[PDB]
Amino acid sequence: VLSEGEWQLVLHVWAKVEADVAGHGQDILIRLFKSHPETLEKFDRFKHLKTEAEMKASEDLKKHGVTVLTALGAILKKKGHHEAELKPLAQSHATKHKIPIKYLEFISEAIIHVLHSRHPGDFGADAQGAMNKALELFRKDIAAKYKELGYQG
Numbered sequence: 289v290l291s292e293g294e295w296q297l298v299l300h301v302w303a304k305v306e307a308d309v310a311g312h313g314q315d316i317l318i319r320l321f322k323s324h325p326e327t328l329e330k331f332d333r334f335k336h337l338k339t340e341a342e343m344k345a346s347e348d349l350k351k352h353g354v355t356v357l358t359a360l361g362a363i364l365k366k367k368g369h370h371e372a373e374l375k376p377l378a379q380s381h382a383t384k385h386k387i388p389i390k391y392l393e394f395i396s397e398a399i400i401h402v403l404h405s406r407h408p409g410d411f412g413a414d415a416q417g418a419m420n421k422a423l424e425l426f427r428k429d430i431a432a433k434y435k436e437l438g439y440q441g
């Protein structure tokens with residue numbers, strides 16, 4: 289359970305993201321695909337992209353980055369009271385998209401790295417630890433839903 293002070297750190301940096309949701313979503317997905325190429329393979333939509341320049345030039349990738357970060361922002365702003373938002377995401381990522389929990393750890397790492405690059409003055413160690421906790425909570429709660437459905441592994 290995050291404290292109120294931890295949530296403030298999380299949402300203070302997240303407010304900086306929402307000034308350029310699409311740029312962040314590109315940096316995060318590109319980092320994810322470059323660092324963990326098995327993740328790109330999960331997107332039939334993106335698996336034709338073979339270079340970082342091709343990734344940066346894809347408008348469809350940029351659109352999807354906004355979809356992802358809009359859904360994560362709505363979850364973070366619930367401060368843990370996010371059951372309604374996770375149900376559907378867990379269900380589609382477990383049963384339709386077939387995304388292992390481990391790849392949610394990978395995209396969490398990408399999110400933290402991009403927030404540190406773009407917002408260092410609002411993403412010192414205290415905020416980095418709080419955002420790590422918030423993403424852990426996200427993963428823990430998605431993982432319990434995966435387990436229910438037979439996908440925790």
Ligand code: HEM
Binds near residue numbers: 359
């Ligand atoms: C912060 C973590 C994530 C969030 C908030 C998120 C959110 C979403 C949302 C809102 C959608 C569209 C609605 C739906 O299908 O449920 C979607 C689609 C999808 N996601 Fe995620 N996602 C996350 C992580 C991942 C990861 C790590 C992968 C793959 C490694 C992935 C793979 C997919 C795929 C394959 C689709 C369908 C894309 C398409 O072909 O249109 N997601 N995601």
